[PDB]
Amino acid sequence: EYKIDETAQLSTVKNEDGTPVNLFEQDMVALRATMHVALHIADDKAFAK
Amino acid sequence: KDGTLMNEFTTPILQEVMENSKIMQLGKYEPMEGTEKKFTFWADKPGAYWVGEGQKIETSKATWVNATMRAFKLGVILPVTKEFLNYTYSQFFEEMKPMIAEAFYKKFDEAGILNQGNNPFGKSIAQSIEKTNKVIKGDFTQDNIIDLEALLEDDELEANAFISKTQNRSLLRKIVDPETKERIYDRNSDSLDGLPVVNLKSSNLKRGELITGDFDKLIYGIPQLIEYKIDETAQLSTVKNEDGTPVNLFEQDMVALRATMHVALHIADDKAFAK
Amino acid sequence: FISKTQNRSLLRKIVDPETKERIYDRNSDSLDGLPVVNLKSSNLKRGELITGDFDKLIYGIPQLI
Numbered sequence: 052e053y054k055i056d057e058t059a060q061l062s063t064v065k066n067e068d069g070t071p072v073n074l075f076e077q078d079m080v081a082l083r084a085t086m087h088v089a090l091h092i093a094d095d096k097a098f099a100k
Numbered sequence: 101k102d103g104t105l106m107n108e109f110t111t112p113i114l115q116e117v118m119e120n121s122k123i124m125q126l127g128k129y130e131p132m133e134g135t136e137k138k139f140t141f142w143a144d145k146p147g148a149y150w151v152g153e154g155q156k157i158e159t160s161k162a163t164w165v166n167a168t169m170r171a172f173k174l175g176v177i178l179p180v181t182k183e184f185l186n187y188t189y190s191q192f193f194e195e196m197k198p199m200i201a202e203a204f205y206k207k208f209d210e211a212g213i214l215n216q217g218n219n220p221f222g223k224s225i226a227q228s229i230e231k232t233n234k235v236i237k238g239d240f241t242q243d244n245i246i247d248l249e250a251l252l253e254d255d256e257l258e259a260n261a262f263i264s265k266t267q268n269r270s271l272l273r274k275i276v277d278p279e280t281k282e283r284i285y286d287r288n289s290d291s292l293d294g295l296p297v298v299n300l301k302s303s304n305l306k307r308g309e310l311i312t313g314d315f316d317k318l319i320y321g322i323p324q325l326i327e328y329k330i331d332e333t334a335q336l337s338t339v340k341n342e343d344g345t346p347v348n349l350f351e352q353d354m355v356a357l358r359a360t361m362h363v364a365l366h367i368a369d370d371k372a373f374a375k
Numbered sequence: 376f377i378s379k380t381q382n383r384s385l386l387r388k389i390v391d392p393e394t395k396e397r398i399y400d401r402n403s404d405s406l407d408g409l410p411v412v413n414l415k416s417s418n419l420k421r422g423e424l425i426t427g428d429f430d431k432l433i434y435g436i437p438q439l440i
Binding site: 055070072073 | 331346
């Protein structure tokens with residue numbers, strides 16, 4: 052179930068800014084991710100001549 | 101405010117109007133979204149034998165956009181607070197869901213048969229009058245009704261039932277033909293000229309019976325309530341009034357019903373006009 | 376008598392001199408006694424023709440590959 056939209060931009064059918072009707076449009080996902088810091092890593096950066 | 105001891109009563113009127121809306125119009129059931137109609141015509145072959153003539157005509161009809169059922173607002177929200185506290189008001193909330201379902205067919209009949217607030221492209225009288233002039237203007241008469249019925253039947257059309265209001269039926273009962281004595285209005289069974297007619301009673305129409313051809317009905321069912329948000333944000337008697345829209349607690353009832361009607365582009369109509 | 380759809384509707388509106396309904400169909404349409412046949416015609420529009428003795432012969436069924 053999706054909550055009422057206010058911050059998200061809408062173009063199709065009717066634009067939402069303040070109040071929105073209670074209807075499911077996109078399912079919400081729950082996830083948790085954390086990456087450990089590496090001591091040595093190779094990365095290339097571009098520089099202008 | 102109420103305070104103590106709440107009671108609600110409902111009169112029998114919506115049950116009769118809901119059943120008459122579908123039976124008179126004859127809405128054919130469909131398992132597909134929108135409306136689908138197919139028509140085929142065959143060409144006549146020559147008398148003398150020389151060459152076999154072919155060429156077959158094909159026609160397709162489709163209707164778009166279905167009307168949505170209206171959700172409960174501040175009216176049911178005041179009753180919902182009483183339903184949680186009082187046992188008698190709790191039963192009234194369940195009865196209100198059944199009354200609104202019968203009212204949905206009444207709103208569909210007013211939009212379908214009459215051109216008060218059309219949702220679809222074809223709205224019976226609105227679709228007929230825009231295509232070709234068929235509706236008669238003037239006072240209701242038995243001699244005029246017999247002439248109008250013959251003209252509509254001759255142009256490859258068949259009438260099933262004519263929708264007429266209670267006020268128009270009383271005026272039709274007083275009028276009598278020069279040769280024919282029968283009118284059928286006071287009795288339980290009513291007919292316009294030959295075939296059986298059922299009363300619909302429209303808010304837009306004032307006087308004159310209108311005959312309907314074929315109608316379509318798809319995805320029609322019953323409204324379901326679980327969670328609803330309000331945008332109006334009405335003030336309540338209990339506690340401080342909130343300016344912000346929608347509340348966490350359940351107060352408003354949701355409604356979900358979709359129905360689309362297809363037009364046959366052939367319908368009879370009668371209207372009163374001043375001289 | 377043979378009916379041409381539009382002619383039958385005009386006959387139903389007219390009433391007889393005696394106390395009886397003229398060309399009124401309760402279950403079946405009849406001009407005098409026997410049931411009238413309705414047929415669509417391009418040339419004919421108004422007027423009914425009454426005929427009894429008429430020959431009608433057919434070779435068989437219309438079917439070919």
